[PDB]
Subunit: 122 residues, 3 copies
């Protein structure tokens, strides 16, 4: 399974902070198997780590269409909107992450902070 | 757009002097989108920087079929033939680069030099 | 030929000990040209060097289906089974490597050692 081999090569680069090479491997995995939710998820993580928030959002949305139970993907999707100043969207995704995993202290903190910044009062 | 993402990954490696990895990313971009003139152009640049002149020529020819207005691609195609000792061809491509961008001092110098070396007098 | 270009990029990474990147390039070469015995062989070598013996076995089997005269591939297939403790299989593949190249001293030594360990006496 060359698609799974590429997903694994991508994970090894991602763990080492080699995000561009991780993205190349994940893209190759996704060209052979577009229904790999784990590869969409980690492709989104690599883009997030590079500061490419819009690209992270698009990859997390694909991962979530395939695996809606991935609590960490909802949390990371929330963080990508939070980084863009889209607080209403971040709140909604943090709440979904917390419905799935109530033990995510980072999701709790970020949700608390996004609620302070959500209002037109800035 | 995974093809554009690969073109961008290729540019990031190319800028850092990681030519082999740039070539992998450009090849993946070109397998998904063969009509990407920018990716053919930069694939030719990466091959040129590795000293692979024949491969640079083939990539520049594809880029130029798609984007004949790329003055820098005509200039680089001229340099790849110049590196092979094919002065008649270099002259022809430098003249085309200069018809498009008369302000390329490097194309002017290289054209001047290729004209000195063109003759059978060596 | 982009498939041959990927095989060459893979060899350049493999020679430098950049096994994960070599695997990415070989996979791309094999997606475009699955009948490239040299690319299956070197993909098996890269997996072997990473300690991924089962993956090396699968790649060597593909290389050997296409090029049964590759004496070094029979020898490396023998080493991958030897690393898994599968001595009967290692012996069989070392004997085939030695029928093709009787001058492989490493195959001779490894065959001699696998024969000592083959028995139920451990």
């Amino acid at each position: 399974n060359l698609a799974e081999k590429m997903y694994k090569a991508g994970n090894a680069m991602y763990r080492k902070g080699q995000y561009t090479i991780a993205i190349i491997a994940y893209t190759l995995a996704l060209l052979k198997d577009p229904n790999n939710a784990e590869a969409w998820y980690n492709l989104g993580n690599a883009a997030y780590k590079k500061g490419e928030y819009d690209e992270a959002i698009e990859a997390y949305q694909k991962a979530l269409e395939l695996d809606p139970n991935n609590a960490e993907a909802w949390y990371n999707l929330g963080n990508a909107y939070y980084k863009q100043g889209d607080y209403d969207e971040a709140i909604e995704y943090y709440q979904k992450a917390l419905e799935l995993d109530p033990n995510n202290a980072e999701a709790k903190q970020n949700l608390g902070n996004a609620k302070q910044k959500q209002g037109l009062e800035h």
